[PDB]
Amino acid sequence: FNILLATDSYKVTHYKQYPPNTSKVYSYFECREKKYEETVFYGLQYILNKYLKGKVVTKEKIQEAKDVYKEHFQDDVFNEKGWNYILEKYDGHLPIEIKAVPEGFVIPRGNVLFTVENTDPECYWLTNWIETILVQSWYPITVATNSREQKKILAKYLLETSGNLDGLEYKLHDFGYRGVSSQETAGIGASAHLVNFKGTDTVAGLALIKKYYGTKDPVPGYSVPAAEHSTITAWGKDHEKDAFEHIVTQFSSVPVSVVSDSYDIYNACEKIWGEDLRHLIVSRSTQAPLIIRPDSGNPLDTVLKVLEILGKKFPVTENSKGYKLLPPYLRVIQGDGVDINTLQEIVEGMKQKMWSIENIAFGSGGGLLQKLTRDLLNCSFKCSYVVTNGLGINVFKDPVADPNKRSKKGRLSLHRTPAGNFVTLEEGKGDLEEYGQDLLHTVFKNGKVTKSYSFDEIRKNAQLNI
Amino acid sequence: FNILLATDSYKVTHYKQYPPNTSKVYSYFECREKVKYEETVFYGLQYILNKYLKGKVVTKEKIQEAKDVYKEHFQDDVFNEKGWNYILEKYDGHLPIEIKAVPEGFVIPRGNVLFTVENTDPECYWLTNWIETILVQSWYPITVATNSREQKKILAKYLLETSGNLDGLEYKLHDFGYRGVSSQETAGIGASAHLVNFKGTDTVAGLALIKKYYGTKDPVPGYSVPAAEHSTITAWGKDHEKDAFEHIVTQFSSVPVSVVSDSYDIYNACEKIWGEDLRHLIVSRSTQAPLIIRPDSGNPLDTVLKVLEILGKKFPVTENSKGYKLLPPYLRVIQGDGVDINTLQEIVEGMKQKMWSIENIAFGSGGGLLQKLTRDLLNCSFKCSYVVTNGLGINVFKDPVADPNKRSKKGRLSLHRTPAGNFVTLEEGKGDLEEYGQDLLHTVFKNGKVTKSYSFDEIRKNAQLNI
Ligand SMILES: C[C@@H]1CC(=O)N(C2CCCC2)N=C1c1ccc(NC(=O)N2Cc3ccncc3C2)cc1
Numbered sequence A: 001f002n003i004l005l006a007t008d009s010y011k012v013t014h015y016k017q018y019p020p021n022t023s024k025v026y027s028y029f030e031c032r033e034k035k036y037e038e039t040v041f042y043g044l045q046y047i048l049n050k051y052l053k054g055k056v057v058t059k060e061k062i063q064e065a066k067d068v069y070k071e072h073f074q075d076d077v078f079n080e081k082g083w084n085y086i087l088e089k090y091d092g093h094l095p096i097e098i099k100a101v102p103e104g105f106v107i108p109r110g111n112v113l114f115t116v117e118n119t120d121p122e123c124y125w126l127t128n129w130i131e132t133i134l135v136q137s138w139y140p141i142t143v144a145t146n147s148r149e150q151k152k153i154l155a156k157y158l159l160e161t162s163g164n165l166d167g168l169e170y171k172l173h174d175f176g177y178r179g180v181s182s183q184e185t186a187g188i189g190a191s192a193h194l195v196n197f198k199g200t201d202t203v204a205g206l207a208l209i210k211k212y213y214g215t216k217d218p219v220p221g222y223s224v225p226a227a228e229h230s231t232i233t234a235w236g237k238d239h240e241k242d243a244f245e246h247i248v249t250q251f252s253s254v255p256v257s258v259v260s261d262s263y264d265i266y267n268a269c270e271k272i273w274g275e276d277l278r279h280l281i282v283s284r285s286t287q288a289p290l291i292i293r294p295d296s297g298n299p300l301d302t303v304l305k306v307l308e309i310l311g312k313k314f315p316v317t318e319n320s321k322g323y324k325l326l327p328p329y330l331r332v333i334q335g336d337g338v339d340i341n342t343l344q345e346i347v348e349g350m351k352q353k354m355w356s357i358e359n360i361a362f363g364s365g366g367g368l369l370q371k372l373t374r375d376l377l378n379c380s381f382k383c384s385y386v387v388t389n390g391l392g393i394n395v396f397k398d399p400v401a402d403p404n405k406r407s408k409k410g411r412l413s414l415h416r417t418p419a420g421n422f423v424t425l426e427e428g429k430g431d432l433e434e435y436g437q438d439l440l441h442t443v444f445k446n447g448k449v450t451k452s453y454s455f456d457e458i459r460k461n462a463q464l465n466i
Numbered sequence B: 001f002n003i004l005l006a007t008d009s010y011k012v013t014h015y016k017q018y019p020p021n022t023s024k025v026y027s028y029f030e031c032r033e034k035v036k037y038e039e040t041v042f043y044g045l046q047y048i049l050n051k052y053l054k055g056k057v058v059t060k061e062k063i064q065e066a067k068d069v070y071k072e073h074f075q076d077d078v079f080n081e082k083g084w085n086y087i088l089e090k091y092d093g094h095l096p097i098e099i100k101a102v103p104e105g106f107v108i109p110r111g112n113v114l115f116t117v118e119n120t121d122p123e124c125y126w127l128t129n130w131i132e133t134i135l136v137q138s139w140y141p142i143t144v145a146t147n148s149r150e151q152k153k154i155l156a157k158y159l160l161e162t163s164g165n166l167d168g169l170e171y172k173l174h175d176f177g178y179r180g181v182s183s184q185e186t187a188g189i190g191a192s193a194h195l196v197n198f199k200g201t202d203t204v205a206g207l208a209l210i211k212k213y214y215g216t217k218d219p220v221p222g223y224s225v226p227a228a229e230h231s232t233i234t235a236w237g238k239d240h241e242k243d244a245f246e247h248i249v250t251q252f253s254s255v256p257v258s259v260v261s262d263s264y265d266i267y268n269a270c271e272k273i274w275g276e277d278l279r280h281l282i283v284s285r286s287t288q289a290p291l292i293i294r295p296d297s298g299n300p301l302d303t304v305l306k307v308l309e310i311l312g313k314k315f316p317v318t319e320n321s322k323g324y325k326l327l328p329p330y331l332r333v334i335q336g337d338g339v340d341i342n343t344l345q346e347i348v349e350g351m352k353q354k355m356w357s358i359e360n361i362a363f364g365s366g367g368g369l370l371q372k373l374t375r376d377l378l379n380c381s382f383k384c385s386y387v388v389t390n391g392l393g394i395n396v397f398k399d400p401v402a403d404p405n406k407r408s409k410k411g412r413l414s415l416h417r418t419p420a421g422n423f424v425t426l427e428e429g430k431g432d433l434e435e436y437g438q439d440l441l442h443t444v445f446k447n448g449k450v451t452k453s454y455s456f457d458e459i460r461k462n463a464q465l466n467i
């Protein structure tokens, strides 16, 4: 990895575009306002450690970058002198200070989450060089936020239909490993989901958390044995019952998820599970349920008909809230077409038919880790303050045709209001101490990570009210 | 990187779930059939083969790491230590796998086999689908390359209609997406997939990926020009936007320069600052070094049309041989905000209706180009179609009652040219009947070696538009 090749091409040319005698560029990140009213701040620490800390400039990296940019631009615009300065003066350590809200913090939209400034007048151009790398924070922030919003919905419906939150942290399982754009994305995205839940099949998340954040527990996330279409269909069309019986017998003492829609989900539930193999299901421990997995059709319609089928073949109870409950040896996971909108629709549909959310868990792949953009929470990095000819100026954009893109002015700080909410003070007004101490902390200075959070603290910070 | 930790958790348990006496699992990848994305660019497998699958991918340390993680992950000892130890000892940690694939850059209709995966050793029947997760991430470069090519088709159509040629087509959609993707690794893969169709990128990560994994005759596969951002304009102070413009175009007087002009008022910047105050520094510029005015806010179509209307009244407009209005060659526009395949179509159609040549405009796309894409867009999917159990081959498939679109293909698969020059996938080993040409799938990976590679130059050639 070469940080001199880890920026948008045009930023290579920006050192020639700032006002002459500019000693400071000060920039901030926010999830711009215009529903996702609050964001989980998560993922910066990964970027600080993997990409920004320590000796990130070498003589070889300056030469590689010079040679690429000469061909890329068909011209010699690369700031060799500026980068050589970093190498010689700071032994290739970035003269940058980053202040950030603690990771796991749940902050309303339109608040400063981190700030970036150069610590050496010569490196005024460096603040926005690292915009591109830092702005990729959008992704863990957005996954963590969207996952937490889904947990709020599950919390509401579980509490309404059951009268408690038991199993909440296992209700949304990460299926997204194959559905993300890369290995690196898999690790970051799966880690962001595990801020809110403990169930993942995206193994890449575990090593990232252990290396960059750390947990008391040996692993931050768990799974159980489960079938896929290959392990059912390989038995032949006429032997689906043989595949089911072999799989539940192999995993007789742990929870086992069995995809049941290879040929006919409704036949599999009513005839195979419900009659042919019923004796191998009703004998299973409460600690080792069969989890039937439909994987096709209208997600709500399929879940309701699956539960109606199972309710007639298996002994259903009515819980303290008046909602129907399968026996403890039998559960359902809907793992197809699940996103925040269809999750809401399924649990509301279940509640209307008097089915407890105790009966169901969700698996989400593309919905959870991939079908997300930087536009969803308007994650944005902008310059708010420069010093030119020794005088500080408050700078901003305010496009006539889009007031939602107006950026904040001057030196920024995050404060508690008297009512215990958050406010971002602009124009250095934090210095007036009318709102107490700045809640941002120095997390990075002059190539060192100066403040860090365990995954355990991040989880605690990201908890729901209830 | 540890390939034993690079699968879906449940695949760790699948070796205990196959029919006993299964010697072979054969699986295939397709962009399943179901506006309408009828043909896909096959691109990206070679990256995955080299970075993740080739050579000694199993060590004693990787087996122990995986065993220790899975014991905690499952709270149970389901990990296939014996199967992985077998690969270490028998093949020096090289995967006993054969992958056959259509050549990269190939444009194939939906619902066709693009690659096949099978174990080459009976003991490693479980290995074929272990590597489903890693291989299925091919969806991303395939989908970026395909969506980029579909945008090139739209640009081609409107450029040809309004100008009478395709000059500059391969520079008309610029990659702005580096900050808008989920990771550094995604940035490189995505930017490389776009460069199959275009030559303009700001996503520098793509260049190194292509150089390392594909290679080009040309020193670099992609190019850029100096361009401002809001920081380099707004840093001058709100009352000095003209000073920022003049300093920037003077600094880059001899190359194309893109200048974001919407910091305060795009319409004021175009009419008063570019159009009157700084007009003398614009009309003197070379054809090789235009000013490129960049709007970055408002309704993308409405803003582009009003920007062109403003510039057409401050600058000498010609009418080309097709009857379409053309800015002077020293002045172009790039719309780099809210651009995706749908808004690109809407802008060029809107421009054509107002008699503006597509010669006047270029597009920058970030999230639209590299991030706002899913595995479900082309139904990119990996399924087992053939197993050998107790020495007899069985044609296998899924066929869910409530969704016929998820029916998978049966048996040993091959890809053929039809007599009419289209593609067909033959099922059930019917390729072995020599009734069609040769199989278009070639061995690209066998027993830990990459056996066939394509340069980026061949991939580009394969991905060309017909015309
Ligand atoms: C939700 C159910 C309840 C539960 O409390 N757990 C917890 C027990 C402790 C570990 C997680 N796990 C459960 C569970 C159910 C199904 C699965 N896996 C599953 O159905 N598949 C994994 C996967 C990955 C990628 N594509 C499809 C699938 C299907 C995993 C965990």
Ligand SMILES: C[C@@H]1CC(=O)N(C2CCCC2)N=C1c1ccc(NC(=O)N2Cc3ccncc3C2)cc1
Pocket: A008, A010, B168, B171, B172, B174, B175, B176, B177, B199, B200, B202, B223, B224, B225, B226, B227, B228, B256, B258, B259, B292, B294, B334, B336, B362, B363, B364
């Ligand atoms: C469209 C115009 C026409 C053209 O032929 N070229 C080619 C000249 C040969 C190299 C590329 N480039 C063009 C061009 C215009 C703007 C830029 N860059 C640009 O506006 N920005 C880079 C960037 C990156 C991320 N967010 C915003 C921007 C703004 C790059 C190239």
